[PDB]
Amino acid sequence: PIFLNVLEAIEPGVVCAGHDNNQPDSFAALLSSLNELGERQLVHVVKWAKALPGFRNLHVDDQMAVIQYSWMGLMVFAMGWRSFTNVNSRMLYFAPDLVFNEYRMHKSRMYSQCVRMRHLSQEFGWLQITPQEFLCMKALLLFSIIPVDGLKNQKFFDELRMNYIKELDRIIACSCSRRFYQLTKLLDSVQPIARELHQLAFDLLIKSHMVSVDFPEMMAEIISVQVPKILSGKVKPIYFH
């Protein structure tokens, strides 16, 4: 069980957003705390990804690119799991100090995206996703979005992605065919959600000075340098189906 030993050992712990929960639920306050949470989670996503089996086989530039394209999906998938295990998924458990109820979903001006994130969260229950299946699926999501012109060493990426798909198939095997279809459909469903959030993030960065929404340093860098490559079609998700 070497592969799952590693995935369990490197899984990040709790990350707080730093939100002041006794101020009013304003658009600016909620979105600023979400941006701060993103900046804080990015630290952990980088350390997690660098410790994955085989990740250092990738060329160093492909290592940062793959993190910088897939962070949205990774973070939404993990938040869906937190919500499913914590508030059972009529709320969104972004962080222990940033839990969205319906009021916050409206004041954030993200209600429709939050609905879709809630549906993602509920699928962990409907499909009875095990912790091992969650861990393998999440690792795969790191290897599920790349430039259309390819990475600096695409061949090493294709081998690594192959091997993570094989590990997912092994966890299922330890009926099988139905399960694999269900899980790969679930993985595919993350990308349209992440794309809606990529669009929201970009639009909000552009008009941030006017809606009093603060963007941390690495969030502002990634949203203005990398996210527009996704929105303009230069970087695309790899779908199973």
Site string for ligand DHT, 112-151 (x = CB under 6 A): ----------------------------------------
- Least distance to ligand DHT, CB of residue 227, Å: 9
Q: Which is nearer to ligand DHT, 75 or 137 (CB)?
A: 75
Site string for ligand DHT, 161-200 (x = CB under 6 A): ------------------------------------x--x
Site string for ligand DHT, 5-44 (x = CB under 6 A): --------------------------x--xx-xx--x---
Name the residue whose CB lies closest to ligand DHT.
38
Exposure string of 172-205, with b = 16+ CB inside 10 Å and e = fewer, is beeeeeebbebbbebbeebbebbbbbbeebeebb
CA dihedral of residues 166, 42, 238, 221 (deg, nearest 10): -150
Q: Is 214 left (phi over 0), alpha (psi -120 to 50) or beta?
A: beta
> What part of residues 201-220 is at the interface with ligand DHT (CB under 6 A)?
201, 204
Size of the site for ligand DHT (CB under 6 A): 14
Residue 52 to residue 12: CA distance in whole angstroms = 12
Contacts of 42 (CB under 8 A, 6+ apart): 71, 218, 219, 222
**Does the CA dihedral 108-105-130-184 come out positive or negative?**
negative
- Least distance to ligand DHT, CB of residue 111, Å: 13
Residue 91 binds ligand DHT (CB under 6 A): no
| The one among 84, 94, 124, 164 contacting ligand DHT by CB under 6 A | 94
- Least distance to ligand DHT, CB of residue 89, Å: 14
Burial class (CB in 10 A: 0-12, 13-18, 19+), 90: exposed
Burial class (CB in 10 A: 0-12, 13-18, 19+), 62: buried
- Least distance to ligand DHT, CB of residue 72, Å: 6
| Interacting residue ranges for ligand DHT, rule: CB under 6 A | 31, 34-35, 37-38, 41, 75-76, 79, 94, 197, 200-201, 204
